[PDB]
């Protein structure tokens, strides 16, 4: 028995990340139709993206970037952020075996293998399997997820470039601290840091597969897949940047 209290922050970035992490949302009987499932996922996704925008505003340094940089970073990274968190829930709740969109919206093996679900679900689940393989910790995850917010930028650079690089490097160092805290030796630390940064680089490829579905299902109105306002606005604005080759993926490695 303990009194109520808020957890004790410490003067470290990961401690703040832990307090600002949004709570997992509930979607609020799963359909037997790919078409209906996709619309439902999008409605949940719009709510998750609003929560992520609020989270980003609290990340140390983010709000000091030019407003245009902030908007651009969220437009370019939203999918990566959503897929990474979906990967984490699927890893923690199902060992990477089921897609855990929300505690009340789990997509089982049968539904993941419906004709029009098979391909997208294989790509949506892949990152979860990697988190499981690497046994990523919560602190490592929180640092990596922040790095994803800071991983997709305009080819011509941001308006607040210097500040952005500084902020991004604080989180790269923070990831190092999360690994070091495991108490492995120097060689193991180097190896793990290389593996986790390789995983971050691999998110760009998974996301390309998923944005291809997102953009096509959004654009072809005749397909009757619905998107909430938040997502529709973002996607509408993101497509021209993506298709013009303006989204540059920061990679740690060659790749």
């Amino acid at each position: 028995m303990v009194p109520a209290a808020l957890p004790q922050l410490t003067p470290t970035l990961v401690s703040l990340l832990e307090v600002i992490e949004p709570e997992v949302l509930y979607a609020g009987s799963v359909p037997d139709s790919a078409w209906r499932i996709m619309t439902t996922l999008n409605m949940l996704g719009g709510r998750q993206v609003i929560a992520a925008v609020k989270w980003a505003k609290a990340i140390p340094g983010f709000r000091n970037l030019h407003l245009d940089d902030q908007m651009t970073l969220l437009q370019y990274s939203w999918m990566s952020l959503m897929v990474f968190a979906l990967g984490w829930r699927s890893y923690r709740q199902a060992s990477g075996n089921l897609l855990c969109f929300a505690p009340d919206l789990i997509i089982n093996e049968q539904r993941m293998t419906l004709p029009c679900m098979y391909d997208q679900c294989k790509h949506m689940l892949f990152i979860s399997t990697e988190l499981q393989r690497l046994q990523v910790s919560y602190e490592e995850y929180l640092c990596m997820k922040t790095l994803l917010l800071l991983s997709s930028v305009p080819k011509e650079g941001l308006k607040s470039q210097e500040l952005f690089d500084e902020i991004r490097m604080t989180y790269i160092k923070e990831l190092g601290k999360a690994i070091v805290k495991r108490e492995g030796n120097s060689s193991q630390n180097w190896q793990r840091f290389y593996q986790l940064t390789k995983l971050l680089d691999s998110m760009h490829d998974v996301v390309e597969n998923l944005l291809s579905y997102c953009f096509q299902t959004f654009l072809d109105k005749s397909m009757s897949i619905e998107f909430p306002e938040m997502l529709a606005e973002i996607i509408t604005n993101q497509i021209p940047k993506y298709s013009n080759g303006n989204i540059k993926k920061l990679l740690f490695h060659q790749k």
Partner: peptide, 10 residues
């Protein structure tokens, strides 16, 4: 063009 996102950020 980016009303909802801009509003949220403001």
């Amino acid at each position: 063009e980016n009303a909802l996102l801009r509003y949220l950020l403001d």
